[model samples]
Target: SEVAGKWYIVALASNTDFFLAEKGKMKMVMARISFLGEDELEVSYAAPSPKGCRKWETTFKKEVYYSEEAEKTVEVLDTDYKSYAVIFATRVKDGRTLHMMRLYSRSREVSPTAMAIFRKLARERNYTDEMVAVLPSQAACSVDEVLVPR
Candidate 1:
């Protein structure tokens, strides 16, 4: 359970045009990752959008977090648990293959070492500068900042 903690999305590199379409300093997300059982993983996160923190929940099987609903496969490339994690995801949708690489961290601050790794990996895959995005950090969603249903 080394990786069982709160994490934040720091950056994203993708070949898909729709991947990082939205951009803003606070347009980030925080996630809660934990184990439901032996190989079952449950992840729930909230992305701040407009005036709402959109809640999203998903369950995955081990490293290959497959979502049949989205036709996406997520794989953990590397992580130190203490600092940062690199994740790669592939999604086949709408006649295009979306290959997205994400850098997540325990802290909201960006880590240069982790970012360096992301860049190398992106370049290895021929992703250009425009294709890679370093997302800004934001405070984790909390009760005070969360949505109150009407």
Candidate 2:
């Protein structure tokens, strides 16, 4: 998988009709995924503080497949719930969209070029330019840090 490791949260957007600018306001945002097969991965997301990591199993969807020609992988995951239709891709990274909410990130740091691409895509999807806001990337999970279930 192109995105088979930890991804630090770098930006966020409101998936809304109007525009709003509020970046770096999130308490926490992080994701860790491990590939289980060619088109499947185990995903865990860390929400705002005081919340435990939520774990889920996900599979790739062909309906929302990657565009090899575009050099960007638009990998969509089937979460079996009504969502913003989680869209993951990257010439730069993951841009997860849920109803009324959207998140953007690179593998680690936020890339301006990557984010520019996202802005264009978001506009094409009817999101206003002012809608997408940047989230600050905080301390990332240490690669050597051990994971223990609490």
Candidate 3:
């Protein structure tokens, strides 16, 4: 509910049977979250692209009836991004269904206890160990390296 801040992409374990994405640059895929209201969040994903690093922003509505088991808030979005369009099951009709379910912290590295909770939630959502990836933080950027909007 109080989820608003810049969060590092520490880990991403999908339900898919395999994984091949680079773990080294996971930190580069940072997410900045800000709330528009009590139930709307504006999220920005910054990462490297074919041309160069860029930031993409999207607004998601918070799910009113969140998971009872997890007892946390969840955000949902339906969009047609290039990344999502490629893998979306019902791309033609429903587009991509993106869900923000991570319990992000202010720090890049999450504690073992926090990770355990995250792992448990991932398992409950059908993510297996082989399919899961725990990305480690590489390096911190200096103030000069920070990107500012024009």
Candidate 4:
């Protein structure tokens, strides 16, 4: 999968519903998108936002697995597009649970086009009432935007 691009950081709702990939100036986190695929994705945490926020150089390993008949059983709000976009599930040492999500697309540019795709999916998926996080761009600073809140 090709890495190095911008991604939206979304939260998995208690109901398994996903919200629109949100962005902020300095109060949210951004999931920097990279590797892309149909059932997996390589992502990073961008503390705050891409505007002026910072974070660490940590990556998230996500994979997507689905069963048509079990759609209702899955509380995640996502689409097949993400299924084809990258892997959706991940397993780590600290703790691992299904990272609630779906897929939209991969992009190095956060232009209107990319954002539109995310927003569109969010709306079509009936997930327009949730909040998300953001971070800075890969070309900005060399430090991580996200850090342990001390």
Candidate 5:
């Protein structure tokens, strides 16, 4: 697991109905990923919310992460594994196609090179600036917080 470590959400674009309605309020998110076994990983994510720290965990196999609840397929589009990662996740519900493009940083800031690549990927996917969100910096969960079981 070259990507096993902490990651901060630098930016993301989504066409999800919920996100389309609430993207303006979205803030930076933190994720911790660890190797579960060969070719398997466990990723725990925490995001800020009015209620409190929203936390969840998911398992990833190969390079694709599966969300049975939403039936989305998440894949790493590119990564050097040292500092940055580009991820894409998509799903189709009914007749609507939902997609998410995300950039992750080893720290709270992303390098210019990664940002350029991410922007290119977004445009290649036909996502506009209106759907992109550059989140605020460094969001964290309570020190004692735990991820809710899936």
Candidate 6:
């Protein structure tokens, strides 16, 4: 599929107690949009890093999309009927440690946009939180408010 205007991540299912991707293996970030002319959007998950690229125990593809029958679909996130939220995945580099940060966003779906937000959020305290704080009705703010470099 085309990569423009699409959200991506290397997330995994969270058990509230811990992240799953942090344990290794392939990960994903689920993205849903009402572009298929239905209230139920087309859900697609993607991997951020390719196989063996990060010195991890398991290596996934540079890009991988969830299939129509990928049992992992139950983990689809960003579902407020109309909103966006950071979804986390538990990816591990050595299959022994559980890292706690594999978040993805429909707000920063694209690469250029994502980078801008990352930099801004990194330097400005509460900026990212502020963006996520106002979601759904304010969902557009993430994309609308960000001023990416040209």
Top model number, TM-score = 5
List the global CA lDDT of all models: 0.75, 0.47, 0.48, 0.38, 0.80, 0.31
Q: Per-residue alpha-carbon lDDT of model 3 for 1-150, expressed as tens digits?
A: 445666665566554222334433444357766776676666677665456666676665542323232333343222122111001111111443333334344566666655676667667767666655666554433112237699
Model 4 regions lying over 4 Å from their true place: 4-43, 49-109, 129-150
TM-score of 2: 0.53
Q: Output the worst ten-in-a-row residue range by lDDT, candidate 2.
A: 77-86
Give model 4's clash tally: 30
Query: Which consecutive 10 residues in model 5 have the weakest lDDT in total?
Result: 138-147
How should the candidates be ordered by TM-score, best one leading? 5, 1, 3, 2, 4, 6
Inter-residue clash pairs, candidate 3: none
Per-residue lDDT of 43-129 in model 5, one digit per residue for the tens?
788888889888887776666777665667888888888898899988769877777899999878778998888888988989888
- Cα lDDT tens digits, model 4, 43-113, are 45554443565655433322323333223112223334332232233323244343333333344333454
What is the model-wide C-alpha lDDT for candidate 3?
A: 0.48
Task: Name the regions of candidate 5 deviating beyond 4 angstroms.
Answer: 92-97, 139-150
Task: Give the Cα error of residue 113 in candidate 6, in Å.
Answer: 19
Off by over 4 Å in 3: 17-28, 49-51, 63-103, 138-150
Error of 5 at 137 (Å): 1.4
Candidate 1, which segments miss by more than 4 Å at Cα? 24-26, 94-96, 140-150
lDDT of 4 at 66: 34
Candidate 6 clashing pairs?
Answer: 11-28, 12-89, 21-90, 21-91, 22-90, 22-91, 50-61, 51-59, 51-60
Candidate 1: 10-residue stretch with minimal lDDT:
139-148
Off by over 4 Å in 2: 16-24, 50-108, 140-150
TM-score of 6: 0.27
Per-residue lDDT of 65-102 in model 6, one digit per residue for the tens?
22232221222223232222233223434444332223
TM-score of each: 0.81, 0.53, 0.58, 0.34, 0.83, 0.27
